[PDB]
């Protein structure tokens, strides 16, 4: 607390007041105490003791002593300024590659600036870097490629829509395919990393050619989510865009993600951000329309963690619906508001696959233009999921299905 | 003198544009080298603009002047001139780090709060995203309708002036030109690239830096630059919202003008990461495999040869002497990636 | 010029577009604007000691420059633009690794000896120069 960072400010003046590489390990010493020591005393700590100048002027032997030492001392402040000047320095140290006991913090070091900003990405990548994390991507070392892993991940998470096109054009999605294989922590971190890279979908086409995401379906319904491996609301945020997708690979990945933090975050915070990301209303979309197994299994398993109702499954066969059908699915995707309204009229399946604006606007009661248009995405969603079998006897579905997947909604009125 | 749009591409080849940027990130702002109003609303025009080095000059020189007139003044004529908005414009939208982290020591130093940088992915937005950026931008008169009609990134990206005008209470037109204004200066950011599978925002973005925008419009329809060149004025119009004329004539005529080799087989549980090794290497040249019960039998009669990597089986081990195929076993009782580039090197002088 | 338009641009515009999209109400005026409408790699890579003389490289740049021979002034961009390099300039009032890439290559070198005005002086190095180059 307070004399904990007292005693170690005075530890870390006196070993910076303390020709060779001692007292180094006297900081690494004093660093691991402090944060296996609550873990707030050695961000604070970090903070205080991180002379970033002094550490960088070791650095271009001693500079194993150096890298290993800086790798702790990585904070959005230090990282912050490091990332003015701490580039014409680290980019020279991943030139060279022949240690191994050194590209372990070079690999680490990366790994942390890659999750920095744009402007960051983008020049630890065009001007070298991202080459020492696919070349490294080759050495069969424990602890190095779980570096190299989340670096790759944080490099397509963080960036913009050129570095990911970079990362494709550099085969990141091969090189991390071998990372894909038993430790059970490295093939999540590729598997998070190549989801993140086919949720764009520029690229989609050549991320499924380099053939790793069949391995995502099969990994995810092998283990349970109780891991314990906090990221903070910005990093939760990250996670939301990836179940809001399909591949059905990405809404995996994003369901066990959130079903570990939603245990994490109800374990130790017991409350709950999800609501302010948005994160229920996907995982009860995901429930509700769902097809497979295993990630409606694990989106169960979250929202029963924090704490609201199970949705169940919808039936496919829309033009057979009553009126107890329309009132359910009216109150799982979120107009509860117009239940009544909906039954006073009583609308069939029929009557609200067929339902038009005037009516809307004039006998159901949705004043405002902007309720209708949430209320036509929700249809058009429902719609390009129903069955129509009986009452097509032609497979025009299909036909529709083939020129564009949005023209599978037109089926009914045609 | 690069502020002026008519000289700007001669005072770019005599190059010393290229100077302002790493000079500017040299040095600190505490200078002390008094202007008067007249001089300082003499470089809001440069922080307003285009091309990141008047930016940064001016973010320096109200750096400076914030200081100064904080330090003798105790005062601030700086929202009289309209510096603090463009500060904060420049905190929100902008990519060096520099000319952020320069508009960041001003807004503070003044005494107002320091908006932080917006996220670029707008079309997964959800409400709260929204109700910061109507707050960052100035419209924190309209936070409780926005949120009580629950407006998206998407419906956000989407809205037009009727729904302004009638739904969300935005009841003068000066008010919704200004909105509008605000918009487009954000669409002209985002990123779409959850929804674009084709890039048509850099097609777009080359003929004119003004018709970044429309790439939201012109997907969200169903388009990309092979369905582009069929479209009409009048489906650009309605279905598209582009309204001006110019924009819907200088994009038609713009858009008119446009099994396997390999069957690696190994141990599983030991020796196994080689394999996939061998997998990228080989698939890295042109040579497609089959790593990963009878479809293996299906697959290895289909593949053009063998690869034994040692380091169940024995119904696989006589499935590749059976039939007429070739071999090339890799033994593992020196770089390991060396070993590999020379089997691939025997592999393209073989096969 | 709000709506983007421009004089190479402005010839492909209609009456319809000038009232509606730029604001030109008097018809005499709308016309009277169609009608007026549709009637309308280096050469010399400087080295110099950074912190001895400079601005004199920099004079150079400016002069030679002024004149029509690309420079490059301002790591292994600087080889792989002096590879490129026509010829070269020692400017004189990490550098034994420069003197040496101006005579691996076949490359012509015109060194420019400092230890009269400067400016006439550097007047007369680039009549030299038009001359020889």
């Not at chain 2, 930016?55 to 003798?72: D, M, N, T, V, W």
């Amino acid at each position: 607390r307070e004399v904990s960072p007292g005693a170690g400010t005075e530890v870390q003046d006196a070993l910076e007041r303390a020709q060779a590489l001692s007292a180094l390990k006297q900081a690494g010493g004093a660093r691991a105490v402090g944060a296996g020591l609550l873990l707030p005393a050695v961000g604070r700590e970090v903070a205080q003791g991180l002379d970033l100048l002094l550490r960088l002027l070791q650095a271009p032997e001693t500079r194993v002593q150096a890298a290993r030492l800086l790798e702790q001392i990585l904070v959005a402040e230090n990282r912050d300024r490091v990332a003015r000047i701490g580039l014409g320095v680290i980019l020279n140290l991943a030139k060279e590659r022949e240690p191994v006991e050194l590209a372990r913090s070079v690999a680490g070091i990366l790994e942390h600036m890659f999750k920095h900003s744009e402007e960051t990405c983008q020049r630890l990548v065009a001007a070298g870097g991202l080459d020492a994390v696919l070349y490294w991507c080759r050495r069969t070392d424990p602890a190095l490629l779980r570096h190299c892993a989340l670096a790759l991940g944080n490099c397509a998470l963080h960036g913009g829509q050129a570095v990911q096109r970079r990362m494709v054009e550099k085969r990141a999605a091969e090189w991390l395919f071998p990372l894909a294989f038993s430790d059970e922590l490295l093939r999540l971190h590729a598997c998070l990393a190549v989801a993140v890279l086919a949720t764009n979908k520029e690229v989609e086409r050549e991320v499924e050619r380099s053939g790793t995401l069949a391995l995502v379906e099969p990994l995810v319904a092998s283990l349970d989510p109780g891991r314990f491996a906090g990221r903070g609301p910005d990093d939760l945020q990250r996670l939301v865009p990836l179940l809001d997708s399909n591949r059905l690979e990405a809404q995996c990945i994003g369901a066990f993600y959130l079903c570990a933090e939603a245990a994490i975050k109800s374990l130790q915070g017991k409350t709950k951000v999800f609501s302010d990301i948005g994160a229920i209303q996907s995982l009860k979309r995901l429930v509700s329309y769902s097809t497979n197994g295993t990630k409606s299994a694990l989106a169960k398993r979250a929202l029963r963690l924090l704490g609201e109702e199970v949705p169940r499954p919808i039936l496919p066969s829309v033009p057979s619906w009553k009126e107890a059908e329309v009132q359910t699915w009216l109150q799982q995707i979120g107009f509860s508001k117009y239940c009544e309204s909906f039954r006073e009229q009583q609308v069939d399946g029929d009557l609200l696959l067929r339902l038009t604006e005037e009516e809307l606007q004039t006998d159901l009661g949705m004043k405002s233009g902007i309720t209708r248009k949430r209320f036509f995405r929700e249809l058009t969603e429902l719609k390009t999921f129903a069955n129509y079998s009986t009452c097509d006897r032609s497979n025009l579905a299909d036909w529709l299905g083939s020129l564009d997947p949005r023209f599978r909604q037109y089926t009914y009125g045609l | 003198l690069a502020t002026n749009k008519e000289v700007e591409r001669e005072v770019e080849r005599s190059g010393t544009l290229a100077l302002v940027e790493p000079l500017v990130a040299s040095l600190d702002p505490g200078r002390f080298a008094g202007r008067g109003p007249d001089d300082l609303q003499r470089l809001v025009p440069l922080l307003d603009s285009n091309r990141l080095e008047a930016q940064c000059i001016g973010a320096f020189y109200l750096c400076a002047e914030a200081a100064i007139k904080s330090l003798q003044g105790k005062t601030k004529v700086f929202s009289d001139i309209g510096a603090i908005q463009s500060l904060k414009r420049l905190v929100s939208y902008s990519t060096n780090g520099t000319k952020s982290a320069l508009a960041k020591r001003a807004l503070r130093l003044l005494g107002e709060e320091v908006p932080r940088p917006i996220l670029p992915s707008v079309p997964s937005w959800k409400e709260a995203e929204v109700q910061t950026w109507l707050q960052q931008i100035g419209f924190s008169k309209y936070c409780e309708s926005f949120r009580e009609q629950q407006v998206d990134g998407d419906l956000l990206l989407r809205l037009t002036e009727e729904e302004l005008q009638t739904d969300l209470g935005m009841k003068s037109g000066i008010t919704r030109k200004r909105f509008f204004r605000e918009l487009t200066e954000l669409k002209t950011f985002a990123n779409y690239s959850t929804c674009d599978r084709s890039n048509l925002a850099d097609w777009l973005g080359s003929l004119d830096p003004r018709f970044r925008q429309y790439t939201y419009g012109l997907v969200s329809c169903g388009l990309d630059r092979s369905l582009l060149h069929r479209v009409s004025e009048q489906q650009l119009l309605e279905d598209c919202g582009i309204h001006l004329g110019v924009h819907r004539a200088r994009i038609l005529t713009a858009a008119r003008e446009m099994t396997p080799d390999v069957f690696i087989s190994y141990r599983r549980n030991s020796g196994s990461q080689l394999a996939s090794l061998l997998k990228v290497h080989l698939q890295l040249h042109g040579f497609s495999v089959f790593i990963d019960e009878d479809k293996l039998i299906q697959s290895v009669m289909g593949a053009r040869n063998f690869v034994l990597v040692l380091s169940w089986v024995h119904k696989e081990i006589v499935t590749a002497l059976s039939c007429g195929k070739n071999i090339v076993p890799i033994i593992d009782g020196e770089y390991q990636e060396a070993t590999i580039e020379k089997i691939i090197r025997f592999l393209q002088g073989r096969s």
